[PDB]
Paper text:
Here, we report that a T6SS effector TseP, from Aeromonas dhakensis, represents a family of effectors with dual amidase-lysozyme activities. Our previous findings have established that TseP serves a structural role because its expression can restore the T6SS secretion in the Δ3eff mutant lacking all three effector genes, and the C-terminal domain, TsePC, possesses lysozyme activities. This study unveils that TsePN is capable of cleaving the peptide link between NAM and L-Ala as an amidase.
To further investigate this, we determined the X-ray crystal structure of TsePC to a resolution of 2.27 Å (Rwork = 0.189 and Rfree = 0.227) by molecular replacement with one molecule in the asymmetric unit. The crystal structure revealed that TsePC comprises a smaller lobe of seven helices and a larger lobe of ten helices, separated by a concave groove. The surface electrostatic potential of TsePC, calculated using the Adaptive Poisson-Boltzmann Solver (APBS), consists of both electronegative and electropositive regions, unlike the predominantly electronegative groove of lysozyme. The electropositive surface of TsePC consists of residues R723 and K796, with an adjacent residue Y720 corresponding to W62 in lysozyme, altering which is known to affect substrate binding. Additionally, the previously predicted catalytic dyad (E655 and E663) was located near the groove. Although this structural arrangement resembles that of other lysozyme family members, TsePC exhibits a less compact conformation with a notably wider groove compared to the typical lysozyme. Previous studies have shown that the lysozyme possesses catalytic sites at E53 and D70 in the substrate-binding groove, while the active residues in the TsePC structure are E654 and E663, respectively. To test the effect of E663 for TsePC activity, we purified a mutant E663D (TsePC-E663D) protein and perform PG-digestion assays. The results show that TsePC-E663D lost the activity, suggesting the greater distance within the groove requires this glutamate residue.
Residue numbers in the entry: 5 to 246
Amino acid sequence: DLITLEMVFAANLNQDKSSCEAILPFLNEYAKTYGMKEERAMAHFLSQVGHESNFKPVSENLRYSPKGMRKIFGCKGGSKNYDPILDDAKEGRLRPKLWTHESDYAFNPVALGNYVYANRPGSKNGDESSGDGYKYRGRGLIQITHKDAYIKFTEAHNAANPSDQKDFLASPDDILTLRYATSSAYFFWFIYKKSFNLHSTACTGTVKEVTKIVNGGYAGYADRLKRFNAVAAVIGIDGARE
């Protein structure tokens, strides 16, 4: 194989061996069909996937308390503008129904997701009554979210795996299976972020630079680097100081 159990276990910080064993065949199947051949890129991929997911598929949790949903989804400019003391937005309520229609959205993942992800720019989600917001919530290993990602994953997975045609608009929960969570990770890597040259950057770049593309930021940077070096060691590749 291109990916051994020891690489996956190392990317998983030597935890949950059986989760690593369960996902190993899909990891190898889709590295072949999507074209993961380069070893330094693979070490970045395993370390980024391991940090995001620990190789277990995850679905976004949209069950929030009243204050919790206001903090994360209610304020213009995001949570940085939540005033905990006032339970209010510092620079304007972006989603005012989280205040006036509190009981409709708190602890109601379907209603909340349909409201807070409605009409998101670039996302192809329709309005609150379309059901797009909850339906295309985050799923996978590196989570993909919103209608646009599920369109693009459908086309990308079918292009790379023509003998296993799927429709993740019709069946979005399949991304919670190990098989299509793994396919979606490779789609993220090679297709979804192609315009940022994620794969190229992993080939000759830095953990920090890979992290910037994957995360849109530097969240969990130190842990992603720790995982990469552990993978580099098992492979025989130079580690990374950055």
